[PDB]
Design a binder for this molecule. Structure first.
Ligand SMILES: *[C@@H]1O[C@H](CO)[C@@H](O[C@@H]2O[C@H](CO)[C@@H](O)[C@H](O)[C@H]2NC(C)=O)[C@H](O[C@@H]2O[C@@H](C)[C@@H](O)[C@@H](O)[C@@H]2O)[C@H]1NC(C)=O
Ligand SMILES: *[C@@H]1O[C@H](CO)[C@@H](O[C@@H]2O[C@H](CO)[C@@H](O)[C@H](O)[C@H]2NC(C)=O)[C@H](O[C@@H]2O[C@@H](C)[C@@H](O)[C@@H](O)[C@@H]2O)[C@H]1NC(C)=O
Ligand SMILES: [Ca+2]
Ligand SMILES: [Ca+2]
Ligand SMILES: [Mn+2]
Ligand SMILES: [Mn+2]
Lengths: 239, 240
């Protein structure tokens, strides 16, 4: 389609408009749980959930690119030590048929640290663990923009908080005219706010039709669960 | 979801968001063709096209029912005498995984004339042929409201027009508070407009999640193609 917008005030267990891969699911409370925690899981574990309908991101015949904006609230919980819990969650755009990749520090989107244009993935990561644990990362939790690689083309310092009382407000926007991708995280309790921005041309990275969604991962020993409360999304070619 | 809205200004051949059944498809001109014509087809032939994602129409947890509005423009083409051409098109809500059924005067939605609650289908029909050809219809072309049966509960007379110069603009609305379903057709060339309405409780007829789409069909000897130019749709539980 040319314009598309949906809004989830909460999720339903028996819903039919979401695709799940890995261990992502909707729990009894009406919350989108991106990954599970328990000893019956592999060392590197995670999940993926995307809206069932592909989004027309750019049109080849007219040479046009769409502008979009999304926003959601999330929270995370861990039985281990906050400073050492892995790995985080991401919001991404990739081909509708992409398979679940490797978990852990790879967010289920990548195979390894080598960059490759064949991924055709554009994600905004909420990376909870950095170096020395993940050598390719800065020495602290951060938010960054990834383009076909686990190495962000840009990142910013993030002071991660855990618990339902520490809900985070996220807002991502892509303005096609200026090829600008901006992401901002805000904690409404005390009003702490952080941002990242990069100039990226989606037209030469992604196919015309992509899927929008989330991914969540963790590692054995430092297990943490990532969850989404609601989701709003809207894209248009006329903006 | 709770809210959903999409707009197709035209359709693309390599689109990935429409699901097809039978002989419906998007042609080179960017138009959605519901059925094809030609002599190498079954006697009763037709097609169906639906948006790929199911719509949350009602909620069993809160007892809420959604309101919706949809609009689209369509036109029909025929090489046979217009008066005799069949069978028409349809805008419908049904289980997302329902199969294509009998075409011809049954629009690909039903098996025959028996009414049955298990169809869980509500459709607004733009029926181009009535009795005696179709014994269950009024004796003339008409636009009607079907609830689990090919026989309408209410219908209004329609003087059908064919050709690209006779495009029709349609608007269908379901207002949850009063349970009113209204459909109106207007020919912009001369402002001729007609409408049909009914009051039906969707929670009692449809499942919580349904697919929305169109169906088109025809018969040998009186073939006609039915085409949609654009489509806008929006549903919400939080009606103003
Ligand atoms: C990510 O890991 C995948 C393995 O799980 C790679 O796919 C494998 O690619 C092999 C070589 O092309 C092929 O023989 C295997 O059948 C396939 N394995 C599976 C399980 O599908 C994948 O490689 C990319 O995709 C393939 C299809 C080729 O186009 C390669 O040139 C690509 O690199 C890995 N992706 C990346 C970006 O490394
Ligand atoms: C519409 O035509 C269908 C095709 O014949 C009917 O389904 C078939 O019905 C048989 C007799 O009831 C059943 O044993 C077959 O398994 C079934 N075949 C297929 C391919 O579905 C259909 O019947 C309805 O659905 C079945 C499952 C029963 O619930 C019947 O009581 C229903 O009438 C026909 N009727 C309808 C309303 O679809
Ligand atoms: Ca990391
Ligand atoms: Ca008829
Ligand atoms: Mn990182
Ligand atoms: Mn009729």
């Amino acid at each position: 389609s040319d314009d598309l917008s949906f809004k989830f005030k909460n999720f339903s267990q028996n819903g039919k408009d979401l695709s799940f891969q890995g261990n992502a699911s909707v729990i009894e409370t009406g919350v989108l749980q991106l990954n599970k925690v328990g000893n019956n899981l592999p060392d590197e574990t995670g999940g993926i959930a995307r809206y069932i309908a592909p989004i027309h991101i750019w049109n080849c015949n007219t040479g046009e690119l769409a502008s979009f904006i999304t926003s959601f609230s999330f929270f995370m919980e861990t039985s281990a030590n906050p400073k050492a819990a892995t790995d985080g969650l991401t919001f991404f755009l990739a081909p509708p048929d992409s398979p679940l990749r490797r978990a852990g520090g790879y967010f289920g989107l990548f195979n390894d640290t080598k960059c490759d244009s064949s991924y055709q993935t554009v994600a905004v990561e909420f990376d909870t663990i950095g170096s020395p644990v993940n050598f390719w990362d800065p020495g602290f939790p951060h938010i960054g923009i990834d383009v076909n690689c686990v190495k962000s083309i840009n990142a910013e310092r993030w002071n991660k908080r855990y618990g339902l009382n520490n809900v985070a407000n996220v807002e991502i926007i892509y303005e096609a005219s200026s090829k600008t991708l901006t992401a901002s995280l805000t904690y409404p309790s005390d009003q702490t706010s952080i941002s990242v921005t990069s100039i990226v041309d989606l037209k030469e990275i992604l196919p015309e039709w992509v899927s929008v969604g989330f991914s969540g991962s963790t590692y054995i020993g430092r297990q943490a669960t990532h969850e989404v409360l609601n989701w709003y999304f809207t894209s248009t070619f006329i903006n």
